[PDB]
Each structure stands twice: as structure tokens, then as C-alpha cells.
Design a protein around this ligand. Structure first.
Ligand code: NI
Length: 341
């Protein structure tokens, strides 16, 4: 049974609610982005209308084989009428195709659902700026002050410099990058670009990347592993055993691997600066954990909400424990008292 925080009151609409069978009274299913916890339940046999971004729509058609007649893509930043209700999709600064949704209820209530997002000051000059929002359904993944991490730019600067240094010292080093979903493609694209290489990967992963409307992508990726010195592998293979084994397969083309694991937050963020990150090393294999986040830090979240001044906040993440729920409610009250809404 669908939880309340996936339902939009005064509408026939649900958000990210495909794993509960037929939801009673749902005339339109919204999908914010193509991550498995959110799409869980969709397949080629799904027969209700789905509303989503153009990029999410390409992934549904090609990867899950949802039939075209049930896929309803909408443009960003554009007022649209769905089942007699005005909606806008806004960029969520998460993974490709991820959106926030504005719902203009027939009784005058305005509702923002962030999906998953990384709040940014640029959102303060989207179509959000033009009217009041009464309720906010908020991605609260990292809603606690211990969650700090650098900007995406700083992390990408660290990665490029690390990779370029290593491969200039040893032209026979291979760079490997882990992945398990869409997102964070800048990591491996930036590295391949500084090295003058294409990124090599499986056919399944090539196919996924072909769905994402990325400019000049045919210039950046390939299924020919032999011609590439940046390889993508499943995240589970990013460990000493997995990498040794992969190095065997390259035919003595390479004698060293440098591997990256983009995580989100990890506790070494409470002590160490990005500049000071060091890898774990076993022989000719080195492995870096890098804190590349596609979710808000605590401070980015707080700033967005204090700018938005919502009347009510409904968390969509960490909702399962009384301790999490009590923690979150305390921060929302702090923010309110400090900003005076
Ligand atoms: Ni996500």
C-alpha cells in the first residue's frame, strides 16, 4: 500500500509510486527520475499514463521496454495541463533527466515535490521565484549538520589532476571508474577528456548513456575497450580482486590501475579536506573514494528552504525511524525560527 507522502492531495496524482500495484484513484503516475528505488515496479506490462522528462522517457522506452503510448514526456520550465491541473517540471540538479514538480491545485494551494535534488542558488531564479509555495515534499537524504562535502567542481578538479599526474608519470597506467546507475557521468567524462581518450564500457552501459541527450556523446564513449584508457566497470568490481582480474584481461597493455569510486558522503569528510584524500593501495593498484554528491548538503538544503519559506514540509527520505523523524522536525523548526516565516 502506497504511503501518504507519495500522494498529491486534491488530485488524482502519485509521485514515484510504481511498486504498490494499481493505486486507488490514481489517474496519472509521475516519475521524477530513472533510479531503481523510484521506478521500482515499472515494466513493459504497465498500462497507466506515466509523466516524466524527455530523458526519463527515453530510458523507460529503451531500458524497461515501457510502451510508447503510456509514456508522456514534458518539456522543462513550461506550464502544462495534466488531467485538468497545471504542472511545471524544473531541473533537480540530480542525475540526467531528474526533475522537481510544481503542482497548482484547483483550490489555490501550490505544492513543490523536489524528487531527489541537489539544492543550488540557481533555483532561486527559476519559475519558483514567481509565487508562493504552501507545501514542500523534500529530499532529506542528508538533513543533519555532520553531512558536509565539497562542491562538484572541486571534486572534479581533484580527479582530473590525480588521473593526469598518474598517467603522465606512467603512460602504461589504466584508469578505471565505478558506476551502478545513471548519475555522476562528469567524473569519467572529465577524466577521459584530460587524457585524450574515449570512455570504454559494456554494451548495456553504452546503451544507457545513449538515452541521455548528452552533446557530442558519440565523440566521448565507446564499446571498444582496447582503444580506451579510461574503463567503466560495475561498482562492485571496484576492489583489489576485481581490478587484478580486470588487469589480466587487458593483455599486458597495462601494468598499473588507478580506480575511482564516487560515493556520496563518508565519515572521512568529518576530518579530511578533498585536497588531502589518499587512496588505498595494494601493489600496482590504487583506489580513491571521492565524495561526489548528487544530493544537497545540510547547508545547501537549509538555504533553499529558508529562501522558499514553505508553510508545511513533508520529508520523503529517512522517514522510517522515530529518531530520524524527530531530528528532521527539530531542524525545520530551527530554520523557521531563525528566518522568521
Ligand atoms: Ni536518486
Amino acid at each position: 500500500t502506497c504511503p501518504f507522502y507519495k500522494k498529491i492531495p486534491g488530485t488524482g496524482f502519485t509521485v514515484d509510486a510504481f511498486q504498490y500495484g494499481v493505486v486507488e484513484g490514481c489517474t496519472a503516475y509521475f516519475l521524477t527520475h530513472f533510479h531503481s528505488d523510484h521506478y521500482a515496479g515499472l515494466s513493459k506490462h504497465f498500462t497507466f499514463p506515466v509523466y516524466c522528462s524527455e530523458i526519463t522517457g527515453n530510458l523507460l522506452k529503451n531500458k524497461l521496454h515501457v510502451q510508447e503510448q503510456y509514456i508522456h514526456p514534458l518539456p522543462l520550465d513550461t506550464e502544462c495541463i495534466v488531467n485538468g491541473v497545471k504542472v511545471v517540471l524544473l531541473d533537480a540538479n540530480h542525475c540526467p533527466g531528474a526533475v522537481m514538480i510544481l503542482f497548482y491545485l484547483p483550490n489555490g494551494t501550490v505544492i513543490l515535490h523536489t524528487g531527489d535534488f541537489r539544492a543550488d542558488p540557481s533555483m532561486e531564479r527559476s519559475l519558483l521565484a514567481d509565487q508562493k509555495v504552501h507545501m514542500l515534499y523534500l529530499d532529506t537524504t542528508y538533513c543533519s549538520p555532520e553531512y558536509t562535502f565539497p562542491s562538484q567542481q572541486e571534486v572534479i578538479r581533484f580527479a582530473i589532476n590525480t588521473a593526469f599526474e598518474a598517467v603522465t608519470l606512467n603512460p602504461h597506467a589504466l584508469v578505471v571508474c565505478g558506476t551502478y546507475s545513471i548519475g555522476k557521468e562528469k567524473v569519467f567524462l572529465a577524466i577521459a577528456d584530460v587524457l585524450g581518450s574515449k570512455v570504454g564500457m559494456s554494451q548495456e552501459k553504452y546503451k544507457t548513456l545513449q538515452c541521455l541527450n548528452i552533446p557530442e556523446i558519440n565523440s566521448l564513449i565507446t564499446t571498444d575497450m582496447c582503444s580506451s584508457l579510461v574503463h567503466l566497470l560495475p561498482m562492485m568490481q571496484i576492489n583489489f580482486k576485481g581490478l587484478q582480474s580486470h588487469l589480466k584481461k587487458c593483455g599486458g597493455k597495462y601494468n598499473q590501475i588507478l580506480a575511482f569510486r564516487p560515493t556520496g558522503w563518508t565519515h572521512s569528510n568529518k576530518f579530511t579536506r578533498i585536497a588531502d584524500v589518499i587512496p588505498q593501495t595494494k601493489g600496482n593498484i590504487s583506489i580513491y573514494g571521492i565524495p561526489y554528491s548528487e544530493h544537497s548538503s545540510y547547508l545547501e538544503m537549509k538555504r533553499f528552504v529558508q529562501w522558499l519559506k514553505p508553510q508545511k514540509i513533508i520529508p520523503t527520505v529517512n522517514v522510517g525511524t522515530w529518531k530520524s523523524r524527530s531530528t528532521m522536525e527539530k531542524y525545520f523548526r530551527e530554520w523557521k525560527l531563525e528566518a522568521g516565516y
